[PDB]
Design a protein around this ligand. Sequence first.
Ligand code: PLP
Ligand code: PLP
Ligand code: 3W1
Ligand code: 3W1
Ligand code: 3W1
Lengths: 429, 429
Amino acid sequence: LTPEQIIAVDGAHLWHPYSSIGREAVSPVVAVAAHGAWLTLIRDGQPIEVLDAMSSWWTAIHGHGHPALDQALTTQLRVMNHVMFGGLTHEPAARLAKLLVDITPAGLDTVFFSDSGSVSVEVAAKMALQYWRGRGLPGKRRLMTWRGGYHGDTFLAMSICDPHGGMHSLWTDVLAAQVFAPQVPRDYDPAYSAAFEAQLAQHAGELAAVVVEPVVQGAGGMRFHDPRYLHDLRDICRRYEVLLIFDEIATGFGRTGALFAADHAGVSPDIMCVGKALTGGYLSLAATLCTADVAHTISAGAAGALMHGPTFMANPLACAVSVASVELLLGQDWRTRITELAAGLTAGLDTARALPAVTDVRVCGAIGVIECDRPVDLAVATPAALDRGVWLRPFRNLVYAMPPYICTPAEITQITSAMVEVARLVGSL
Amino acid sequence: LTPEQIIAVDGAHLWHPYSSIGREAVSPVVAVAAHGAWLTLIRDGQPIEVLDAMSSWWTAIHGHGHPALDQALTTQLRVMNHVMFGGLTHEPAARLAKLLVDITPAGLDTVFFSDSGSVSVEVAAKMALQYWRGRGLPGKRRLMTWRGGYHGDTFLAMSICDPHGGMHSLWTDVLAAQVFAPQVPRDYDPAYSAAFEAQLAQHAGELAAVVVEPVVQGAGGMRFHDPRYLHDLRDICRRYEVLLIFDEIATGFGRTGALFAADHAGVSPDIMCVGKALTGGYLSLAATLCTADVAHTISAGAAGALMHGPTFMANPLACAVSVASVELLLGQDWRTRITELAAGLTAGLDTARALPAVTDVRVCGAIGVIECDRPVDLAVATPAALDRGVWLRPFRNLVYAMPPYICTPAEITQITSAMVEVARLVGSL
Ligand SMILES: *Cc1c(COP(=O)(O)O)cnc(C)c1O
Ligand SMILES: *Cc1c(COP(=O)(O)O)cnc(C)c1O
Ligand SMILES: NCc1ccc(Cn2cc(Cl)cn2)cc1
Ligand SMILES: NCc1ccc(Cn2cc(Cl)cn2)cc1
Ligand SMILES: NCc1ccc(Cn2cc(Cl)cn2)cc1
């Protein structure tokens, strides 16, 4: 298919994320290649090379077409593409499980594989609810979280999305009614944690779990909070016997400067979700980890088996490329790399602070954010970024980047320069 | 890793489908290769080749490692592993969308890709609810189905699984309360349809959609029903203004003897889900199709964009191998192939009818079922089939096969002989 043919088919038949089909002002750009940190896009009939500043929605941490990950996939393809995990096991699942239990916060020793982040959140919730059924306390069936959060798009995941500002706010009337604490602040304030504890204590008898994104809230606004709040949540949850669930689907695998964001606080949750960067951005995969105690209690009393079983659970191809991606991360000085990335983002974004439409500039590990004083118009931002050789995808009032870890300092500065120029145009006519 | 190393890791760390970790009597068997219709499994430390009679949970319709599908994957890998579908489009998504709209029942012209079958069902429900919001009828928010059904394991999907004796039956007190008609019979009885209509009529003002598996109900009990019931559902839904959703995640791509099971009835649903065999069993992918009316009425409306967007939406690798799998199917006389398979299954399973523990033997396309009067003990069934060179995975009281379409008559004879012996052993205790 030619790019024009792709556009024609796409316009007629393809539904894109978070969109109204046939009614979008900005049509999709045809992508025809991806190699390393770079995408080849078609613009005005011509191929152009642009930096994947988004890591393809925060997944491509080693860039595209990395030889180690390419070869892990083709090696597995030669031996066994896929077998059913109902009754069978295999080397890629075993290797990945062993890696994941070893590098995640202490105590997480069991792994349930699934095929997407939203599903892994549903599995986490099912684990928490079934845990309390196993304890003979089925009244513990609600979830508690703080505002500003995002956890996926399936219906129970939607129920812990920010109710007022979140993307799922129109569905409130048909979603499970959960408990929401106020927006967690950036700076540490003991009064916030005291209030959180007071609220949880009032509901502890009907709460299965607290579910949060640790340190960075991504899709709900790229907000950062002090890691000490996580220490407080762990303490509160322990004392009131409410399970703690960390959704690290966006924060995992080095993105915030620690291997997992929980590590900034030294905290272990009872249950943890991972995804996105898990596969290095090659294939959809996710996992839900829990403690031995959670796993065993889930089938205690009359609760029985955990009745979940995705058709492609523990897919050998996805697991094999994840093993390679994780081993590639651990086998280098990733902490120094991310520290260098963060410094590049900070240095490169500093001039944006003085721009008239900019309300905040903030960086956490390999995440760089310009918060603007109005929603960013994609019809303006997209050409401006492409004109400067960078793929950016703003949402709401945020111009942000989550770049591949393999970006050179020059490439990071190219990305930040494009972000600054997009922000300059937001406050231009 | 050696098989014994895999077993040790698996026992310590891996949660398998529908199971109580650490409490399962039958431990998983190590799989070390798959090719064509065959798996290489480890029995007492030794590698044996056995037939994948289950097609790895009904996905591997062309067998494992088919050269055309292998090549399609490796070709795409060299060019572009993945890019985000938020703002970008690409050739594999366009090619697959075009194929799917062309070969599905008439009127389905819009494709929303997702990462798993359960998610595609949640997307279908979301489309249906948002449709009626777009018509100014937000009270139309419940689903109706018949008993015996299965639609996945996420919490909305669970709500249309049969609450009485279905796999999610312990969760009734938590799930959305849907409307259930009685079990649809095998033989056509217009009285059943009239009763379904009268029940639907009473609820029409609060129903968004009827959701069913057409012709074959898979995971809920391998039951078959007359296609004329689907014709009745289409008419009832038309007259009472309720959307019709067909879940073809198990029945799609030739499995029941028609390309899609809806084709047996000659009707089209408003919304359709596909998955499993979509990728030929290589990778997790699913899709939700809808009509132009549904697509355009969503976002009419005041009701805005469809707020769903899986991170790995329309993954180029998964789309590329699916395109190859679908083209491979369409490029052969698949209808004759399935007819031959059905004949082989019928001939091979016939002697099972006389067995004392057997209550029914039934075949529909490339699906063969022996229904027993008692649960099938996996601890007995698994070694018995393996020693006969066949991988079978019974569940509840069912010994069944859904073999790869590439199985030779000899291989089908081998599969059915193993099934018959399992059924024979069931009636020995
Ligand atoms: C397999 C299947 C699904 C989806 O299950 P997943 O585990 O998410 O793949 C949904 N509906 C039907 C009828 C199925 O057979
Ligand atoms: C991306 C993400 C998810 C899952 O979304 P999917 O679209 O299912 O991949 C869940 N939680 C968080 C915090 C995420 O960033
Ligand atoms: N479903 C995964 C996912 C990934 C990235 C984002 C970012 N985002 C995009 C929009 Cl539109 C709003 N937020 C939102 C959701
Ligand atoms: N989630 C997909 C899927 C696929 C096959 C089956 C078959 N099955 C397995 C058991 Cl246990 C009960 N049914 C059940 C679920
Ligand atoms: N025409 C394909 C097809 C469709 C439905 C069934 C199941 N069934 C057949 C009859 Cl007759 C009653 N039920 C068996 C085969």
